[PDB]
Amino acid sequence: MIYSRSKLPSEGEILIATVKQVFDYGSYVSLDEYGGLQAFLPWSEVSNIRDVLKENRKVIVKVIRVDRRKGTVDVSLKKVTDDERRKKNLQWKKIQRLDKILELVSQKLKLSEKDAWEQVAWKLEAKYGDPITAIEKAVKEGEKILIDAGVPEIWVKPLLEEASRKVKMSGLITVRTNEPLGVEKIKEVISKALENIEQDYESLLNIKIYTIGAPRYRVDVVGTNPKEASEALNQIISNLIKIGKEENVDISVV
Amino acid sequence: APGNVDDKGELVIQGKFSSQVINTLMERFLKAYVECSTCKSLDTILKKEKKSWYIVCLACGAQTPVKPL
Amino acid sequence: IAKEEQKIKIYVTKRRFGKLMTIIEGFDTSVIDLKELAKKLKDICACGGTVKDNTIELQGDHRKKVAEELVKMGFSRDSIEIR
Amino acid sequence: MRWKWIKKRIRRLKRQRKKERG
Amino acid sequence: QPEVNIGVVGHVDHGKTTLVQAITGIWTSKHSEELKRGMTIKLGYAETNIGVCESCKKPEAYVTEPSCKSCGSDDEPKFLRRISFIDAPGHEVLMATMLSGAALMDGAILVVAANEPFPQPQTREHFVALGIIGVKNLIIVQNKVDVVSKEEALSQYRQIKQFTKGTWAENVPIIPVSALHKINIDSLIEGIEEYIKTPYRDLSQKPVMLVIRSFDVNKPGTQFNELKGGVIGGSIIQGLFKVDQEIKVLPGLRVEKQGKVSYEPIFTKISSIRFGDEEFKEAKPGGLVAIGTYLDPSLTKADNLLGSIITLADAEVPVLWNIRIKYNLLERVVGAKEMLKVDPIRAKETLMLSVGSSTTLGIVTSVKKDEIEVELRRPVAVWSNNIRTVISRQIAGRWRMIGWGLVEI
RNA sequence: GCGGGGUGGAGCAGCCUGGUAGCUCGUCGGGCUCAUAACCCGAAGAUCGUCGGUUCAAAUCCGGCCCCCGCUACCA
Ligand SMILES: Nc1nc2c(ncn2[C@@H]2O[C@H](COP(=O)(O)OP(=O)(O)NP(=O)(O)O)[C@@H](O)[C@H]2O)c(=O)[nH]1
Ligand SMILES: [Mg+2]
Incomplete structure (x- = not known):
């Protein structure tokens, strides 16, 4: 609806x-x-x-x-030009990022997907834009972009919390060591590198690091945002190496 | 080669093999998994445990242990 | 270290200009290294050669030679057939 | 030629010098 | 912990492992999947309890649990000792690991098959390896007596009683078994209780131990935070180790510098001790132990420090490249189907030097009557002057025992 | 522990992005040819491992539980 x-x-x-x-x-x-x-x-x-x-x-x-x-x-x-078949095909995924939000928010609030399209999506249409980019400025900046246009203040927070789902990305690393307490230096150089990572390349969902061989390890950054994948995984892998190299624990990507 | 049994008891091997080399490799089977090693009867049960199967004759009463496969 | 044994068919074949060639087929491609075997065999035969899918090919008749070299390496005399 | 020979001589030397070293 | 290490030797498929199944109830796994289709390949391992039914009649008195109500009546069998086995493989070429194993053994059991021509290539090969090394506590066993004539397991007992004669094996007793159906095993238990006696080991001695496995307890995917340490697998021979002792391995890992070679000792602490499936705080000789460590499991994955030896940290052990063997030869090659005479040793030849549990190769520089000097590839940590060694050659593609002796430093 | 596959008898597409189950073979019938399943035509036949959810709707998307094969490894 x-x-x-x-x-x-x-x-x-x-x-x-x-x-x-x-x-x-x-x-x-x-x-x-x-x-x-x-x-x-x-x-x-x-x-x-x-x-x-x-x-x-x-x-x-x-x-x-x-x-x-x-x-x-x-x-x-037949009368769709193929230079009319792409930009109204990108306009589709934005108009079905909206459909979903008002298909679960109207439900949650227990109202209607009509009183969700009449109030939210027909008053952020007066605010020059597709109503999913007057909410993409909202969830990042604030709820004062929703109030500005007069979007009734019952939908405002149930919107911003139903808009901001998983993406899984990984990498093969190689942790060779000769230290007397090497196992402890691995756990160290992984718990010092997998550190303050939940707030740098920010709110991602989980990180798992594990032995799939003996020296070979998989790291696993799942994230809400796909381009909140390598960014993070790569900072983790860059700090593995650096904190691996500084502390005599030999690390390198495959 | 690959295969599965039909729904009325028929082997459909997916590879066209001559009507001889199936007998020669079906006799060998008999020799290693049905013919007891004491009196050559073919009248045998096939035991299974952890990792040791036995050919058990219904005539003499002995047991031919077999490589479990 | 490992083991593995296989049925070995050796026979004369055919290549372009130049002489016949010798095919050695039927080795276990997981366990056995046809590339290490074949480097060794090209030394015994003194012929060029390759690993041709799951076979070794050796330029010229080398059929008594190779069987004699394969049995040495700890392969079974009874699995080998020169045709 | 002298490529050949130099490495043949070197290989002979090494291999043999390996056999002497051993 | 187990008190004593017993071998189970013999020819391929004669049922050495099946006789460790019928005593311990434990299978070696038969693994690598290739062992699940071949047979036992890495050294098996299994333990059990030997009590005794005091209140009943022998040999059936000789129990496996605290349970006497099985034979005569209940009086819970006084526990005599706990033991552990080491099942060597039986296939001709897996000679180099059975030797290796034999540096740990306090006694053995020779499993001959009752349905094959007695002196089988490995049955002998093993036996004289035994006589060579010094494992003078042997019990022969005739295994597959469940598939033969009652005349046939006697006529073979002749053949065994005649071979076992000119050789050192006086009353080495031949207990016929049936490892398959576990019949007459309690009489084998009476043998092993009498003849394979528990030796005395002086604990005050310098801690020394051999290694024959070592494994990454880490399953496919244990997270970094609970990455348990690496695990060295082997048997103590002299001393007793304790939980939280500083330690070193030898000769230890080699470096690479542009084609150079250089081994060196690794240090670590004992993270945990365990025997069987039960964790201990100390460890003593007899039995194979295992030592949880704090060193990178990449170092001890597949079985990387196989052949190494563990000692006290800050101890005194030479890591030799080159070595003075005093030695002697067999007159035959008891091993090959064929008995071809052992030639005298030639210089600049390749031979397989078994020293302790390590199975190295090495090249011969000097040749006297009975004193040879051997340059090696991977070093050897020579913990004493009483290092028994074993000397093999490549006769025909497959490696063969030909001489033995002692290591001199 | 990760996968990879599971679908008319058989070989397997399709599953991404859900919307009358396709192909090749076989069978079976007929036809064409002098006689050939050589070609032409038709039929039969898979509720798409299993159990369940979501969906108006699923072989598809989703998750527990199996069946073979790569990866791992005897895990003190
Ligand atoms: N009839 C009979 N069969 C037996 C007996 N003992 C063992 N077997 C069978 O013989 C086969 C080989 O047994 P196994 O113990 O592997 O022999 P092995 O000498 O220990 N093999 P490995 O050289 O690897 O140590 C098994 O499949 C087993 O079922 C016996 O006493 N009687
Ligand atoms: Mg065995």
């Missing part, structure tokens, strides 16, 4: 629709950006035809006809 602030799409617009039923001489589509607004798609506008006419792969189109009278819309997937 992506609700819209219109009754019919404007004619010659591009949007994400979902195929609903495969009929003989066309196919009824649901224009996902208009309250699942049922439109028609004939064959003269299609073009191996059983994976894009799939019962509901979500295909992108151009609106050919909008008969405002009856309430019925035609669409075509």
Whole structure:
């Protein structure tokens, strides 16, 4: 529930629709950006035809006809330029980073995905921007970016805590030593390197370091953010080596 | 080669082998896992423990231990 | 250290310009090193050669030679067949 | 040639000098 | 802890391991998966309790647990001692680890197969290795008597009673068994209780020990925070170690400097002591021990310090490269199917010098009547002047015992 | 301990990004050819290891529990 602030799409617009039923001489589509607004798609506008006419792969189109009278819309997937098929395909993952937030927040607050799209997503639309980038400034800066535009102060915190899930990344290191109490120097040079790492390259989820051979070890930085992977893992691995080299514990990446 | 048994008791080996080399390697099996070592009867049970299987004849009463495979 | 033994088929083959070649096939590619074996065998034969998939190939008839060199190295006389 | 020989002479020397050292 | 180390020697598949199963209940694993399809390969290990049914009749009186109600009646068998075995392999070429093992043994049991032609290539090879080294406490056993004629295990007992005659083995007693079904094993227990007696070892002596395994307790994936130490596996021979003693290994790890070679002693502390599956605070000779350490398990993974020897930290032990052996030869090569006469030793030749538990190779520089000097590859830590050694050659692709003697410093 | 696979009988795609289970073979029937499963046509046949959740909807996404093979290693 992506609700819209219109009754019919404007004619010659591009949007994400979902195929609903495969009929003989066309196919009824649901224009996902208009309250699942049922439109028609004939064959003269299609073009191996059983994976894009799939019962509901979500295909992108151009609106050919909008008969405002009856309430019925035609669409075509021939009349999408392939320089209209990418930037309204990046606009899809931002409009379905939003859908999710208001699909779990409205639920949590126990209200409606209509009163979640009317209040949050139709008053951060007045604030020049896709309502997922007036919340990406919000979760980082503050809840005063949500209050500014007049987004009712019931959604404000349930939004900011339902927006900010895992990503797993690793590396093969080699810990060779000859110290009398070497095992202790390994545990040291790992608990001194895996240190103050939960606040440098910040709120990541867990770090595990373990023997998969004897000298070979895997390190494992899982993180909420994918580009909060190597950044961290690499600082850990850089400090392994440095704190390994300073204390006579030979360390190196594979 | 690979294979599994059908749903009515039939071996489907995935590799086309002549009708002879299956007998010669099905006799050898008999020799190592069914023919007891005391009187050559073929009338045997196959025991299993931790890591020592035994051919147990139903005629004489002895036990031919076998490499467990 | 390890062990492993295998059935060994040795025979005359065919290469381009120049003479026949000698195929030695049927070694266990996990355990045995055809590259260390073959360096050793090219020394005995005194022929160029390679590891050709899971085989060693040796340029010229070397069939009595190789069996005589393989049995020395601690391979079984009874697993080897010169064809 | 003298490439050959120098390394042959060297290998002879080493290997033998290995056999003397041992 | 176990009091004493007993070998189980013999030919390949004669059932040395199966007879350690029927006494201890413990299998060597049969592992490397390649051992699970071959047979035992690394030195097996197994322990047990030998009580005695005082209130009943022998040999069935000789129990394995505190339980006498099995034979006669209940009176809980007085415990006599706890023991431990070392199962050598039986395959001809795994000669070099059985020798190695034999530096730790206080006594042995010769497992002959009742269904094969008696003097089998390794059965003998082992035996004379025994007679050579000094393991004078032997008990022969005729194993597979469950698959033979009652005439056949007697006619072989002739053949054993005639071989065992001109050799040193007076009344070395031949107890027929059936390792498979564990019948007549309690009579083997009466043998081993009588003949393989518990020697005296002076504890005040310089702590010395041999190593024959060593393992990374760390499973695939134990986290760094509870990375337990590396583990050296071997048997004490002289002294007694204690939990929290400073220690060194020898000859120890070698460095690399552009093609150079240089071994050196490693130091560490005893992190933990354990015998069987039970942890101890001290350790004494007889038995194989294990010593948890604080050194990097990468150093002691697969079995890296195999052959090494452990001593007190700040002790006095020469790490020789070159060595003076006084020696003597067998007149035959009791080992090969073939008995071809042992040639006299030639200079600039390769031989496999077993000293202690280490199995080194080395090259011969000098050759006298009975005094040779051997340059080596990996050094040897010579803990005493009473170092028995064993001398092999490559006869035909497979390594063969040919002479023995003593290490001179 | 990590994987890697599991799918008509058989070989296996598909699983990423869920929306009438595909291929090759075999079988079986018919046809074509002089006679060939050579070709042409059709049928049969997998609730996609197992158990469960999420989803309107799953072979797919998810997690416990198995079955073979690489990795590890006898783990004092
Ligand atoms: N019938 C019978 N079979 C036996 C007896 N003892 C052992 N076996 C069988 O013989 C096989 C070999 O036993 P094993 O103990 O490995 O012989 P081994 O000499 O110890 N082998 P290794 O050289 O590795 O030490 C096993 O599969 C076992 O089942 C026996 O007394 N009777
Ligand atoms: Mg054995």
